[PDB]
Amino acid sequence: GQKVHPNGIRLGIVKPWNSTWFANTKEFADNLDSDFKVRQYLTKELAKASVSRIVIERPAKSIRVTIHTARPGIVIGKKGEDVEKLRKVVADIAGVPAQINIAEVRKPELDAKLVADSITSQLERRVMFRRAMKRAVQNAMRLGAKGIKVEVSGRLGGAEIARTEWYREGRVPLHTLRADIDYNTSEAHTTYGVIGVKVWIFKGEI
Amino acid sequence: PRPKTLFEPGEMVRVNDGPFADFNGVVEEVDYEKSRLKVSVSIFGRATPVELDFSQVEKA
Amino acid sequence: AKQSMKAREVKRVALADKYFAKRAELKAIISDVNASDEDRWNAVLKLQTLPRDSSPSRQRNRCRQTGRPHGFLRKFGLSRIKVREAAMRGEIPGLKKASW
Amino acid sequence: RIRIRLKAFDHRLIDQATAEIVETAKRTGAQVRGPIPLPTRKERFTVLISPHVNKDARDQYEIRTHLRLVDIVEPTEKTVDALMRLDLAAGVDVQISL
RNA sequence: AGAACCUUACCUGGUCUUGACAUCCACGGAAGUUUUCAGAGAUGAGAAUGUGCCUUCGGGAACCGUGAGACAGGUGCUGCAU
RNA sequence: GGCCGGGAACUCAAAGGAGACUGCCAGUGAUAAACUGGAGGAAGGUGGGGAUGACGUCAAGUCAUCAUGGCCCUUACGACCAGGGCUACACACGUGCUACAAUGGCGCAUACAAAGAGAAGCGACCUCGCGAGAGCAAGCGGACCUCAUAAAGUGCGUCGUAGUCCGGAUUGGAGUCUGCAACUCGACUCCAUGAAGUCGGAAUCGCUAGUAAUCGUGGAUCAGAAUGCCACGGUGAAUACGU
RNA sequence: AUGUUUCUUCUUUUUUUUUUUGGUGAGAGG
Incomplete structure (x- = not known):
């Protein structure tokens, strides 16, 4: 909202x-x-x-x-x-x-879509997201991105409720119009419904 | 004689004079009073609405 | 909407281009200041000989992406929920936030 | 006399796109009746941002469609020869008005 | 961001089901177009006329019908499975 | 008649910059931040407005945009058609519109906009028509053409505190166009009709400036169908002791 | 002044590129 x-x-x-x-x-x-x-x-x-x-x-x-x-x-x-x-x-x-x-x-570890569908391929093959989304974060931090926030949502881990988790590392000034941000979405269909992934990648200025 | 030029709206025509020579197009608007046909030429994709005389273009 | 509903539209598209706008002279000239006897009765009644679902007034207005009935926009030609996700994706050439 | 009407979205591109046809017409005709401003339509839209109720939340979208005029004065038979099929700026819809 | 019909998901009633719509296979029929109509209309009974391209002419593509089905379809329930 | 030569400063137009940053002065303040006045300035203390909405909260709303785990129907809850209903009516509430009149209504004359829309679309002009509109048809796929001759405002005549030249619901009749179709169930128009209502109890809402209020216009939706919603500009207030 | 009961858990292993200056005519040497 x-x-x-x-x-x-x-x-x-x-x-x-x-x-x-x-x-x-x-x-x-x-x-x-x-x-x-x-x-x-x-x-x-x-x-x-x-x-x-x-x-x-x-x-x-x-x-x-x-x-x-x-x-x-x-x-x-x-x-x-x-x-x-x-x-x-x-x-x-x-x-x-x-x-x-x-x-x-x-550098696919700096392009938002390429980070997002990677976790989609991860989470649809039944892997633990906690170190799969941690993997994508530590990837971009050493590949030249000034900051990256990765968010996953859904009933991940086979749980009954929809546990949501987000995690960032570095600057992500969403409000700043001068701040370039690479953002894209991807969704994963396991047997536990749909797990959507959202990732923000901040780079810099005009 | 070769004087075909009559073209109504939506009618294709042919250009054989000026830089638009060797090009075809359609007459979206016609002006018998001004003796001028409103036809555009597909130059580099974008239609190039230009006014050509009946003798300047041939009926297609 | 429904795959059943989207099929009825293209069926009523096929009636609106075959019969109507082509056999539209049934009311264009012959239901006017012309022979207003009961030959003009044959103008209005032969219009009923063509099917009811063939009129362009019958083809309501539906989205092309998903086919939602309401909230249509004529310029983009697709539904209001679909024009926004394509606005944020950067698909409509020029839609930014109107903040005047 | 020979008008050239420009149409685009990217206003930061059209001033160079008209400049690309200024230089194409400067070395041929040597008289071009300026890059006239030609006011732009602001097609305003509004959209219910929600997929449901609460008709208070809306988003406003507009498209500034910019126009220009070049207006080649003299029809010397080499000016238009350097224009037809010799233009650029894919995405800028061009048109003659004559 | 606008229910006279349509919309429309509801009711009365008339009909139809490998189907309103999609992919696949079998055989025939080009497709198309015009007309008489049963009936409220649907659908169905038909009657003319046309029978275009590729030629691997013992068949494909475009397209309609008929048959078997694997299925398609659902504005059906659960927003506290998402 | 900016209508025609002609002019390029102007309005306007569309691009790029200049410009307002507590920058300057004075007092105040811990040589702090900063605050209160003054100067210059179009604008002065984020100039005005807008977009922008931090982790999370209601395990809020949507399975009916769509996507989707299950669950379930599959001669069916799927499908096709005609007609009906969503508009039905003792009654209550929400939100608006029109008014209850004299800074007001009706008639005549006349002034001043902005913004937006337009091709199986907007429609001049002239003509038949009391009117809704119809016929022929300029131009315009658009700063040029058209919708489109703005309303209060003003000048004047005029009615004279009345349920009345207020108000106009409802009702009968005659018609206009859209569309296959206006009966259930469109809008509009002409003639006729004339209701309640005479400023509203408990209670409750909006608004701090070009705002409230009031007036007229445009647009999306749209075959047709606004008093709604979204935009525009005209006119233009009162008060803010204070917690 | 009042506001029913019961009533919601975490893994730590998972991840390949890369592309297969010719002719004709004459003369001469062996």
Whole structure:
């Protein structure tokens, strides 16, 4: 009942959007829903590839797809082999020609999404979260992050009630608009319901 | 003769004069009184609504 | 909503583009200052010959992401709960907090 | 005379994006009728932030759509030749007005 | 952020069930489009006309029907399982 | 007629900076922080407003946005259609609107906005129409066109403390458009009608300034359907001894 | 002045990359 989205309110001064184009009022919904299925199917196609963010830049009558991953080879396949299979079907989904492009991140222990789905892979294979979420914290503290808070929630540990636990290490100034924060969410479906994970990673200034 | 240029709204046309030559587009608006057709060209993706004369463009 | 409900919409989409807006001249011209005898009776009644669920007034308004009935927004074309999570994810090109 | 109407979201990009077509038109026509301000629409929205009751909690969202004009004066037959298919700034929807 | 029908999840009643909607397999039928209609409508009985691409022409893709099912579906209960 | 040449300072417009930081002065204060006045200044003690909501609290609300562990139905609680109901009515409460009139109502003349919306959409103008609207159709996929000729305000005439040129619920009749469809169950309009009510008991709420109050406009929703909600600007107060 | 009963626990082991300047004509030497 508090704490509005970190990636929500920085979008005019710090972090850019994840879909940068302009379309008028007649085709604004048509552009938006097509973006929703190219984010759905691609994350479905590249679940294990450890993809963090996807940038969708449409210069009209075209779409530039960007994939930010920690596993470059699995994304591109074998020299672009899987990408041409996507090229036939990404253009089939959005109904427009697709110029697929690939980016990368060097440090997955500093990218919020990559930290979050790691605990998702941990907690769905029945491991103890107390040293699994401690693992992700001590990872980022020595990888260059100035501070990181990791939160897990749900009925973790097979308990009846929903025991919630959060843990931080270092600066995490959520209120400061000058403070860049990498934040993302992931959820884990065990047989004990859904366990959601939320992690904040603070880096610095403008 | 080759003088095809008549284009109503939503009709595709052809440009063969000026930098827009060798390009096709549709006439969203027409102006018979001003003798000018409002057609945009798909230049670098974004439609480039430009006014071309009937002889400046050909009917598609 | 319901997978049953989302199927009825696309079925009523198929009626609104096949019959209506194409066979809409049944009321456009022939139910006006034209022959106002009982040939104009054939204008209003042949409009009933087309199905009831074919009118664009019948296609209510539903979200495209999840299909929620209420709280729709025409610009984004999807429901109010879905426009906000995509706002904070950074999906709609330009929505920041309006703090004027 | 030959108007060029610009449309974008990123106002910090459009001043350079118009500058990218200023330099493309400066070396060709040498007379361009300025980067006119052209006021921006502020499409205001409001959304019930809750998935349920308590219609007191709302969030307000807006989209400043910025416009510009370039307005190439003279139609010398080399100016537009350097413009068509030779533009940039993916995400900035451009249009001519003539 | 707006129930005349729709919405609609409710009631009376008329109908239908591998189905309102999805993936998979079998055989036929292109798909489509127009018209007479049983009835309140649904659905069903039909009647014309069309029968496009790939040619691996002993068959795929696009798509409708029929059959078997593994299932699909649920605004059904539990917000103190989440 | 800024209508036309023409002008680039101006309003306005859209970008980037300047600017207010107890920076300067005086008293006060432990040479402290800081407070109370003064100067210069558009703005002065966080200038005004807004977003922003610390661990946790109610094991608060949502399984009906959606996601999901169980649990359960699967010729069914699933599905399809027509009509009805969600609007039903002894009664009580919540929240608003219109008023109870004379700083007021009706008629005539006339002044002054902002913001936002617009393509199977907004609709000039002229024309038939008492009216709702209809016909033909400019322009505009938009600082240009249109919705859109703002309201109190003022000047004047006028009624004369009355249930009445106040108020207008309800009711009968004749119609306007939306839409397959207005009966249950739309809004609006014309003619007719004329209620309660004459400033409200116990009790309770909002507000410290361009605020309260009052007036008119726009918008999302939307085929159609606001007095609501969200935004805008016009007019413009009283009081704050004090804990 | 009054406000029913009974009524809620913790592990400490878990974690691979990385990519397979030609032709033609003439002359000459062996």
